[PDB]
Amino acid sequence: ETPPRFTRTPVDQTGVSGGVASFICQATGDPRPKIVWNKKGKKVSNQRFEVIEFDDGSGSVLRIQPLRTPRDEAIYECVASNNVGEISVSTRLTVLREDQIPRGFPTIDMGPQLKVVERTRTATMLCAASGNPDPEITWFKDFLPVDTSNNNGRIKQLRSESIGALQIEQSEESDQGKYECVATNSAGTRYSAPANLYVRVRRVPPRFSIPPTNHEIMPGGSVNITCVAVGSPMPYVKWMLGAEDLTPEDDMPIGRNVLELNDVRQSANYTCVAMSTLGVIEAIAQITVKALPKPPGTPVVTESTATSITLTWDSGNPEPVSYYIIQHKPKNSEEPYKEIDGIATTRYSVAGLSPYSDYEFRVVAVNNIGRGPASEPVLTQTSEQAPSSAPRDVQARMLSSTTILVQWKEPEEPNGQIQGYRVYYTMDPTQHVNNWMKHNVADSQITTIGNLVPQKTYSVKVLAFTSIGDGPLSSDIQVIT
Amino acid sequence: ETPPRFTRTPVDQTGVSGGVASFICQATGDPRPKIVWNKKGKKVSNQRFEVIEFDDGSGSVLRIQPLRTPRDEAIYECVASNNVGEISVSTRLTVLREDQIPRGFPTIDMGPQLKVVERTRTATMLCAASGNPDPEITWFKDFLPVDTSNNNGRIKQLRSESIGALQIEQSEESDQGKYECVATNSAGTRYSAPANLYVRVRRVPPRFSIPPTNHEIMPGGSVNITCVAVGSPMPYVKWMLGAEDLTPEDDMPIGRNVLELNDVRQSANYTCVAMSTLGVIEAIAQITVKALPKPPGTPVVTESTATSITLTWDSGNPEPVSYYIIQHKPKNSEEPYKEIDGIATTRYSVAGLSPYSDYEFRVVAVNNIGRGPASEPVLTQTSEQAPSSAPRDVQARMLSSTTILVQWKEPEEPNGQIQGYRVYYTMDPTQHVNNWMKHNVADSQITTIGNLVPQKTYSVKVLAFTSIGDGPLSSDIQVIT
Ligand SMILES: *[C@@H]1O[C@H](CO)[C@@H](O)[C@H](O)[C@H]1NC(C)=O
Ligand SMILES: *[C@@H]1O[C@H](CO)[C@@H](O)[C@H](O)[C@H]1NC(C)=O
Ligand SMILES: *[C@@H]1O[C@H](CO)[C@@H](O)[C@H](O)[C@H]1NC(C)=O
Ligand SMILES: *[C@@H]1O[C@H](CO)[C@@H](O)[C@H](O)[C@H]1NC(C)=O
């Protein structure tokens, strides 16, 4: 929230009896400031005082017409306020009689003219005024000031050395209204008479700008559906159920009927009817109720590798499913299921898994309504591999001149049940490993080897094996008998 | 008071879904009938239904847009009623779907287009439509039907092959609005899209159509003073005591403000202010207070003739008098005075009177306020004339051979006091009358004349005389001695 701050303050004015005076006050703040006009100290009430508001609520214009003097001759003020703060600015109004209107006071030599431009074509409203010093020309539309501040806009104020005009680049229905030009200088202010501007739109039968688009949802179960029609003359947009009109009869709105539905208990068809004097046009929306999908058939494992598992499942649903979501995690991992989104078939291979691991699964169905309940789970296990790492911390030491003790720790990557180990040893480590002497052992971390020849350097290497095959050999260690 | 009677009854219709249908009902009666639209005994209440009233209250239009079937498909009725009677007429509405629109049903091939004509120039809106049988083209303005019934009017419908049109002679602000054309046949009715028509008035400063004209009146004491202004755009008219605005101070009407003043006590000036953005104009009315004039000075006779009397009088008033009224009658007439209106001075000669008659007179003063009390009367008498008719029934008869008896009746037109008579007689009626023998007599109707010569025819003539002179002689009678 921010307190109100002035974007545009009213200026002193010097008008002429039986004329117009306008005061402008704009302010910004959060929430939107209210603007109030005071004559010390009173909310202004009168038949000739009129407060006109900007469409954006930026503020308001105090318009005094016709000026009668010296009642109106006074100090007025604008107060902008929200529940965060308050600001005010004062301003003076002077009204003169033409008995005592100074010469050189702004005079309208020619005022704006009634004009009819068609849409999107450039219209020009013109103002000739003289005075000494030379009068500055400004414009008012529907009592509000016309903003031509941006040189870069549709609407630009041109002034030449001969007094100026207002140029509207691209016409809109919004442009239509009552324009008056205003000649000001250091002596005062004078208005021209109002000249209306009208804009002709070619007569067109009605047409749907935004037709009403079909839906499905679970019961109770609500939706707002928009029907927009446009054309000239702009039509009435009436929402019609088959025969009966929801909207009463006394009210048919223009160009926009948006329908609110509570508790869509049943499937239905609805009609949006738009009509003007040139025709009736119609358009239907299909409202049907269907639920979220049923849980899929329980997943079945039909393929497995050491790093993948392929699932197949029944759709479990009477109507077509858009796609599936597969839920997966390790048998005892307890974070919420990891999910693979956007699976467009009833079979999928989950890859990037680890060898010899237990996995948990479910399948979820998704249709246009949304996401259904997860299927019942299936448990399974990835295949084994040969180990992908050597036994760790391999050590050997002398027991006697003829026997040694070899030990190791389990490989970090067994990729399966360790069925055993193979111990390779030799006095010549340059041989191929298949030509070393070999000692097979069951699952264990230590063994003894005898019948060695004394006072020799033996090189030793160890691997693990699963049901699949041999793992890698440890790098050579040496032991001396 | 007269009961309501239909001038225009609605007709059955066959429209198309999401379109327009209009029903028309007009009726006349004293007092003005109200019109109510019923669907089965019940007043129809605006779904999208709209009842639009004629500016003269002659009736209303029931407009259904957009057409919905088969809800709207029903028997409707118009009921017209005042406190003198009640009437109704029924009508049927048929709405079709374009799924089932018959071949030959009216179609708009081109509908009216937006148009901008300036004031006092004729704009024409065009409509091309087809159908089988050929469609009849009609027009609606601002939802009310356009009456081109009088061939003799500003507004006439043109027809060629496959087209109709609307032609508006001399454009007026009233003509501005939203026009749509309508194609009808035995299959049904179809509307085009609405196209607005504009009438652009070149902008003008305000001006007084009916300025405020001064007054005088008695205290308490009331008057309505009217101020009218016109121009484009039409201005506001405010009444001012010359410093401040008369309450409702902020309320401002358009182009016509009339000030009602109750219980006037004093003389004053009032200011009427009309103002626009292109300038302010002012205008004053003078209110001053006093009653009808004081009665004039008693009239004085300064001239008299046998047929006229001239009056002179003092005005009797502190302020100027506009003119006078002279009252006159015979003195012994007990009927009300005859009056001579519009006498612009303080002297006047009343002519066409009868000789030697008594007359009564009075003078009345009139100012801008009104007519004052009559003056005190003056009595007088017209002058005498010589008689203007001869003595009547003149007869003479023998008394002796030397004397005759002459008698007569008074002239009908003495024009004065008969002072006497003169009897002319002779034996030679060929002489001039002044050479006859003569016998003067006082006021009487009979005389004797002697010393006549026997056995002779005497011719006799008699006249009357007043103080003025001799009247006419009777025609000759004869008497024999
Ligand atoms: C449905 O409409 C309500 C109405 O307030 C709105 O808040 C909600 O966001 C809408 N929901 C959807 C799913 O459009
Ligand atoms: C909805 O429209 C479809 C046409 O594809 C039709 O087969 C189905 O029976 C309609 N459903 C209802 C509930 O009317
Ligand atoms: C003055 O105005 C009132 C307003 O209704 C009207 O009734 C009355 O007849 C008017 N008087 C005159 C003298 O015009
Ligand atoms: C009204 O104004 C006139 C000037 O037109 C002035 O002579 C007169 O004295 C004024 N009367 C009053 C009562 O103010």
Numbering used by the authors:
A (entry chain A), B (entry chain B): 28 to 508
Task: Provide text from the study.
Vertebrate type-IIa RPTPs comprise LAR, PTPσ and PTPδ, which share common domain architecture with a single transmembrane (TM) helix flanked by a large extracellular domain (ECD) and cytoplasmic tandem PTP domains: the membrane-proximal PTP domain (D1) is catalytically active, whereas the membrane-distal PTP domain (D2) is inactive. In mammals, presynaptic type-IIa RPTPs form trans-synaptic adhesion by specifically binding to their cognate postsynaptic organizers through their ECDs for inducing synaptic differentiation of neurons. To date, five different types of postsynaptic organizers for type-IIa RPTPs have been reported: interleukin-1 receptor (IL-1R) accessory protein (IL-1RAcP)7, IL-1RAcP-like-1 (IL1RAPL1)8, neurotrophin receptor tyrosine kinase C (TrkC), netrin-G ligand-3 (NGL-3)1011 and Slit- and Trk-like (Slitrk) family proteins. To elucidate the structural basis for decoding the ‘splice-insert signaling code' in the type-IIa RPTPs, we determined the crystal structures of PTPδ-ECD in complex with IL-1RAcP-ECD and IL1RAPL1-ECD.
The meB insertion of PTPδ is important for binding between PTPδ and IL1RAPL1. The lack of meB reduces the affinity fivefold. When the apo structure of PTPδ Ig1-Fn2 containing meA3 and lacking meB (PTPδA3B−), which we determined at 3.5 Å resolution, is superposed onto the IL1RAPL1-ECD-bound structure of PTPδ Ig1-Fn2 using the Ig1–Ig2 unit of PTPδ as the reference, the Ig3 domain of the apo PTPδA3B− is oriented in the opposite direction from that of the IL1RAPL1-ECD-bound PTPδ and cannot interact with IL1RAPL1, even if structural flexibility of the linker between the Ig2 and Ig3 domains of PTPδ is assumed. Therefore, the meB insertion likely acts as an adjustable linker to locate the Ig3 domain of PTPδ in the appropriate position for interacting with the Ig1 domain of IL1RAPL1, representing how the meB insertion contributes to the affinity between PTPδ and IL1RAPL1.
